[PDB]
Nucleic acid binder design. Structure first.
Length: 855
DNA sequence: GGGTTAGGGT
């Protein structure tokens, strides 16, 4: 056991804290409390009964409206902007199965529609069921909800279906996503929403009385939310005999969903796609005859294969398969050659290249742009080459989606983003390197890693389809068919890779109180040891009690659309009057960063971030300064150039702002704020006290701490070697994308972080420098004692600091009062009065935290 | 000295 810096406090400060805690201690309307005990009192049977009576709107119908809509629909299908829009609908494969679908839904509570790209299931099935109900004089009883995994899908599909009915958005079809909705009319309507929206709406409607039909789309993708929702459907559907659910899926392990709903009827609907034929590594080498020159366990795989194709391909080609380097994207000059080849033969169309990530995308972009081969300089000005990556701007721009300039061929170098999320139309050739990146959690070592892995069979199929939108194409797979038989069917369903604290907490608000029993019923049960880690984290931040029952704090946390830790940090910012910068920190962690990472500008992005960090040594405060600067450029009508100069996505920035206000409105509705504006002066009297902000941030990211021990100033220009290790002892560093990477001379040696992850070493993706006293006040594992002959005060029983007894005894009594205050604020929420008993304890905490302000 | 990809009423 070692000993850290002294945290004893001056006597005058100690005496004023004592006065203020004694003032706090001589203090003597909660609908929320009654709500909370009421949730805890009812068993599941009473829960259902109460929700049936509470959500009763669809027990009511409008016969004069039924009749009106039935009439105008009959009329509008004799007019000629419809009845042309109807011919082109009847060209879709799904419309041929219309009448069977109507009847199959009528006879079964659950059906499944399976169909490939082009089958129109997503646009047609909701219209089929709606127009049917309208024509039968049942309009007002019909409310259809169709889920989508991605926000952009929910918008575009809704817009298209609305056009297909000669309506503007918001009449019979609408959409709802986070913080943005063009809502449909109440009844006889179709609404497209992202799955999360429907999950959150269960809090009020836990058995789905406010919709008549639920369509789940894209379930084959096995997102957490669709996997969650089907599990909840097994609980909901026994009490909802009238509800109709339509599962919808691509042709990837379609049988599992069918099996899971015990055997329900399954439609298979043909697609509309132009033929894309697959080549593999043997076939590409035969047309290109590139030559490679500048464990195995490889040839164990490839040699048995090599010989049953002995007489089908040339002798020199099957030599190059022997090289482990031929498969994947290890040799970028090979893929470069295959792009050069497609430009020559193989008439005109765009080339879509799927590479694993940013680093390797950059290597091929430079080869394509500044080539050292003679053949490539021939092609350089006759390609228009776009990279494609979530962190790069090209996606949010018009060009990559449009056809190239005359005499130019378009080449797109992309990550998996172009498989389903981003879609380009004039692709005819796909180069599928077969390599992608993935995050895996090793439950035993608490190490998240980012590893390069092979794609699955399903992925490769999806990439093939991206060539067959406009005309027939070709898909070049840079691996042998011996590899494809090594590949998995699907990616690992993401429920198995995820932290579970959020779901377990959310389940309690649906009166699913046993997360082990319920989660075991999903299509793939998560590891029960990952459930225990979830419950444990929730017990530690005090959202669940020791027995595992919900606490008043946890119910609030469950009602915030954000992870429970950052929820708690957002909440703390309300009681401690630093609302604006903390919700910026929260929003940027829950969402992504507003900074692009354009190619070749890695050096300059680092300067921009350091400059916006304002030497405050926190990746989180750095985002808030960015938001403060962004608002100012809107006040100066200089937004575009501010965004240009500093590589900022105005789109993510504006969404971060909408998230900040959502948090404000919720905390305001929950009686924690006097004002719903996250910039209100009253909610922000403390927002420039930097030591205070590190304390509230630490209260959120705790217990994820690191301690730094080393220096360097020799001698290149500006870099330093760190010796740093997390609370568990493992040696870490700041990720190069962090503003603290390579920095020197820190006012404190301790940091908190949101994500640790190993790619080339164990990195902290984001950090904020914290001070020990702040950790001690908001953390746990705090005891005072004597170890060498020295009095100490510790945190997490891991970091021990010299501390005299007078300071320790006061800090310990202070933490006691802090816990008492948090416990009441959760049960009996109210804003903290500016001149009350509760403010005196707050002033006690600010007083101790300010002792660390930089002189 | 490095960034696979999606998401959260009123």
């Amino acid at each position: 056991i070692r000993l850290g810096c002294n945290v004893s406090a001056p006597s005058g400060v100690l005496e004023r804290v004592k006065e203020l805690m004694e003032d706090y201690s001589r203090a003597p309307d909660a609908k929320f409390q009654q709500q909370f005990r009421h949730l805890l009192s009812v068993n599941f049977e009473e829960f259902v009964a109460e929700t049936k009576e509470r959500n009763a709107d669809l027990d009511w119908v409008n016969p004069k409206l039924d009749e009106r809509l039935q009439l105008e629909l009959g009329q509008r299908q004799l007019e000629e902007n419809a009845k042309k829009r109807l011919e082109a609908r009847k060209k879709l494969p799904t419309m041929k199965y219309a009448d069977d679908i109507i009847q199959a839904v009528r006879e079964n509570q659950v059906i499944l529609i399976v169909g490939s790209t082009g089958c129109g299931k997503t646009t047609q099935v909701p219209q089929i069921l709606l127009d049917d109900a309208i024509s039968r004089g049942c309009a007002s009883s019909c409310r259809i909800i169709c889920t989508q995994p991605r926000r952009i899908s929910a918008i575009a599909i809704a817009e298209w279906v609305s056009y297909e009915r000669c309506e503007s958005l918001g009449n019979s079809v609408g959409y709802q996503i986070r913080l943005e909705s063009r809502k449909a009319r109440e009844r006889a309507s179709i609404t497209y929403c992202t799955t999360g929206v429907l999950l959150q709406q269960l809090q009020s409607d836990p058995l789905m009385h406010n919709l008549s039909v639920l369509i789940l789309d894209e379930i084959h993708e096995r997102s957490v939310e669709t996997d969650l929702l089907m599990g909840l459907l097994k609980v909901i559907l026994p009490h909802r005999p009238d509800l109709k659910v339509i599962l919808m899926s691509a042709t990837v392990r379609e049988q599992d969903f069918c099996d899971y709903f015990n055997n329900c009827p399954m439609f298979r609907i043909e697609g509309v796609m132009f033929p894309v034929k697959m080549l593999y590594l043997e076939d590409v080498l035969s047309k290109t005859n590139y030559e490679f020159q500048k464990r195995m366990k490889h040839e164990a795989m490839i040699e048995p294969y090599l010989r049953r194709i002995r007489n089908s391909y040339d002798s020199r080609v099957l030599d190059k398969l022997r090289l482990p380097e031929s498969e994947g994207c290890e040799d970028i000059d090979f893929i470069a050659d295959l792009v050069y080849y497609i430009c020559e033969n193989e008439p005109e169309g765009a080339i879509l290249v799927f590479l694993p990530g940013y680093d390797k995308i950059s290597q091929l972009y430079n080869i394509l742009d500044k080539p050292k081969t003679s053949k490539g300089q021939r092609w350089r000005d006759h390609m228009a080459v776009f990279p494609l990556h979530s962190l790069m701007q090209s996606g949010e721009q018009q060009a990559v989606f449009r056809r190239p300039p005359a005499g130019q061929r378009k080449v797109i170098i992309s990550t998996i983003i172009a498989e389903t999320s981003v879609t380009i139309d004039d692709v005819v050739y796909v180069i599928n390197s077969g390599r992608t990146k993935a995050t895996n959690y090793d439950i035993e070592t608490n190490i998240q890693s980012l590893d390069e892995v092979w794609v699955t069979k399903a992925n490769t199929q999806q990439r093939r389809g991206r060539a067959g939108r406009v005309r027939p194409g070709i898909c070049y797979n840079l691996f042998s068919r011996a590899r494809e038989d090594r590949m998995d069917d699907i990616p690992t369903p993401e429920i198995l890779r995820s932290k579970l604290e959020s779901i377990i907490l959310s389940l309690k608000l649906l009166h699913i109180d046993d997360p082990y029993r319920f989660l075991q019923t999903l299509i793939n049960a998560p590891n029960p040891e990952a459930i225990k880690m979830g419950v444990e984290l929730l017990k530690r931040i005090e959202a669940l009690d020791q027995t595992g029952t919900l606490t008043p704090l946890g119910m609030h946390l469950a009602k915030l659309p954000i992870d429970p830790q950052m929820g708690k940090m957002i909440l703390m910012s309300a009681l401690f009057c630093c609302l604006d910068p903390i919700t910026s920190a929260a929003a940027a962690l829950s969402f992504k960063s507003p900074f692009y990472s354009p190619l070749g500008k890695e050096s300059r992005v680092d300067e921009i971030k350091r400059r916006m960090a304002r030497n405050m040594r926190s990746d989180h405060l750095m985002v808030h300064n960015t938001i403060i600067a962004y608002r100012d450029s809107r006040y100066s009508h200089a937004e575009r150039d501010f965004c240009y100069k500093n590589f900022l996505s105005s789109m993510t920035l504006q969404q971060l702002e909408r998230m900040k206000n959502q948090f404000s409105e919720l905390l305001y509705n929950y009686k924690f704020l006097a004002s719903s504006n996250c910039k209100d002066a009253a909610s922000n009297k403390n927002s420039e006290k930097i030591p205070l902000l590190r304390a509230i941030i630490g209260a959120g990211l705790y217990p994820n701490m690191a301690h730094l021990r080393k220096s360097r100033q020799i001698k290149n220009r500006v870099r330093a070697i760190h010796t740093m290790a997390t609370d568990d002892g493992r040696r870490v560093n700041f990720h190069p994308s962090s503003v603290n990477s390579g920095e020197s001379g820190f006012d404190s040696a301790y940091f908190v972080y949101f994500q640790r992850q190993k790619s080339t070493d164990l990195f902290l993706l984001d950090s904020t420098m914290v001070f020990p006293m702040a950790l001690i006040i908001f953390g746990d594992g705090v005891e005072a004692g004597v170890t060498q002959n020295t009095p100490y005060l510790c945190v997490a029983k891991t970091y021990y600091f010299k501390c005299n007894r007078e300071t320790a005894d006061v800090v310990i009594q202070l933490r006691s009062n802090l816990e008492k205050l948090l416990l009441k604020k959760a049960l009996y929420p109210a804003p903290i009065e500016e001149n009350g008993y509760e403010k005196q304890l707050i002033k006690a905490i600010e007083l101790l935290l300010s002792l660390d302000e930089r002189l």
